[PDB]
Design a protein around this ligand. Sequence first.
Ligand code: 4WI
Ligand code: 4WI
Lengths: 299, 302
Amino acid sequence: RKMAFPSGKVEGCMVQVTCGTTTLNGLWLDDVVYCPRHVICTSEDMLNPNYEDLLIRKSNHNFLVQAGNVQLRVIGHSMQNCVLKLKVDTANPKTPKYKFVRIQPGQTFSVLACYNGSPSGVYQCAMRPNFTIKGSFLNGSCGSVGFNIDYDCVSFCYMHHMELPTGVHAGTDLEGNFYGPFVDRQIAQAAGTDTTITVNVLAWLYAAVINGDRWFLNRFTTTLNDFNLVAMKYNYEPLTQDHVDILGPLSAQTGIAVLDMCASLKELLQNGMNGRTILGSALLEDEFTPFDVVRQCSG
Amino acid sequence: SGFRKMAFPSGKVEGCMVQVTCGTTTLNGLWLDDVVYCPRHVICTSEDMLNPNYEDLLIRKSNHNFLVQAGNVQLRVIGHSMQNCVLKLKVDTANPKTPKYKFVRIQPGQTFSVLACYNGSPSGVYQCAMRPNFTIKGSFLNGSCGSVGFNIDYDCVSFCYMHHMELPTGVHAGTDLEGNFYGPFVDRQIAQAAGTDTTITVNVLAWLYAAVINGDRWFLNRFTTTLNDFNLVAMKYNYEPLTQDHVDILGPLSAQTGIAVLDMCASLKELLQNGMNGRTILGSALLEDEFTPFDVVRQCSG
Ligand SMILES: *C(=N)[C@H](C[C@@H]1CCNC1=O)NC(=O)[C@@H]1[C@@H]2[C@H](CN1C(=O)[C@@H](NC(=O)C(F)(F)F)C(C)(C)C)C2(C)C
Ligand SMILES: *C(=N)[C@H](C[C@@H]1CCNC1=O)NC(=O)[C@@H]1[C@@H]2[C@H](CN1C(=O)[C@@H](NC(=O)C(F)(F)F)C(C)(C)C)C2(C)C
């Protein structure tokens, strides 16, 4: 099934940041708190903000940072793209090993949804090819982060900023650069047409084969270039060299060449599933990555 | 908005997980105060699991045969007792990370989070429900026993499940923290099958309300039905009956959407008799039944 990473290492980094009456969540690592810069905005400000001018008027003593009800004094502030960086007087004793990463469309991560600095729930999702995520976020969730854990290292990849009219969500990496062509202004914005994540569908078919569900395999293969041109006709993402590489381990485990699985997928796309299921499903799953299959099938 | 299968944050439980070893058998334990809880079959060899004499096996053990590891540090066992299918190991150090907690026994249909662990180390968290046939549709591998399921209310962890075994159909079975199995199963390595399962009707309706709150409305219709006439059709399709307490607990979702519970029941009735026409609800091709009304209110309202 779809699992989240254990959230404990991130829970110990969640704080709340307040300007005036505007409050959201921040991320406390060592002696720095990271949060969306629109915390410095009033309601009217958000309709058409001048962030450079709003920050010039701000001082350290205007920022209220709290871990629980314990205040952390801000001793410096700066803006990096769409994130604020607030230096505080206390190094977080629960800081884990960590890094900041910018992920690619199709990569999955866990989200720790927080409100008023208080973790509320954890769920798994993926960066869509149109650079949105199908999240679950209510008022006050901004600053919630998405992450992956490898070994003892937390790779932070997403911070939440906004919800689009179609009910999907958009945000930045931890250097404040939006995923996608979105801006942190309350103005009409729309997600592009989404596509299906082909590398992930393939990983899910490999998973099916590993579990003994393999009726969909044909005795044919294709060329990468031929597969990519046909895939786009069904609103499927084309494969990159990196996609073919990260499928290597699953190809080796099953002995099924990547391009042979591509040929099997193409036949599925052309003829559908004749009232048949794969892993108990009539829909092809596209939010399980090859890493997810390995991690969840090996423990 | 949006709607995801959501688990509780797992940090408070991660701080309680440890490793327990007997001979060559290793699994997970739950360290609360100065006691470690774990499945009793940790004391079994391969031959023992095929036909265990648990009380005899435990009388023949001593404290020092139990190797308990928290992180990289060994804890010294100073006592041990057996409560049903659970072993309690008294250790000489209290867990400083112990949360406020209670042990509860849940009813079928209720949901909970599972923190899957291996060798005392947390691996993943996911949301489950207690099936009507007392199994759970988990994801557990070798070494996962002693993983627990829980809910959190404010700052209090309610432990409701500890993992013990996997049935041949791939569903899972375990105990409450008093060591009593959910369902008619035993901690012995012998073929065991579960009763026939049913769908958790009140949960399906809560999820239909979630789909409406999120703008997925295609399955609604202009009709209503009586509670009894709905239950007749539900039971025909192997769905649980809907009680008046279930109707009441759906009230707040009915109020938010303006859709009476018995109006939604008429839509579910039509879904059961006609199928979904290959359409989806909240991106699902099947009716989801592992969100309670509380789960939906909490995620869609706050
Ligand atoms: C931050 N706590 C929220 C998170 C939102 C609220 C409901 N669900 C979410 O994910 N972010 C905002 O309120 C941001 C903030 C001003 C407006 N905004 C929006 O998300 C708005 N959306 C847009 O303006 C749109 F459509 F362009 F995406 C809103 C209409 C409130 C959903 C700023 C700076 C974008
Ligand atoms: C605990 N570490 C494992 C967890 C298992 C391993 C595979 N997936 C799981 O959830 N539990 C066990 O190994 C228990 C333990 C001996 C046998 N067992 C089983 O789960 C076996 N099942 C059964 O014998 C059956 F059919 F009754 F469910 C197994 C065939 C190994 C899955 C005991 C005492 C039950």
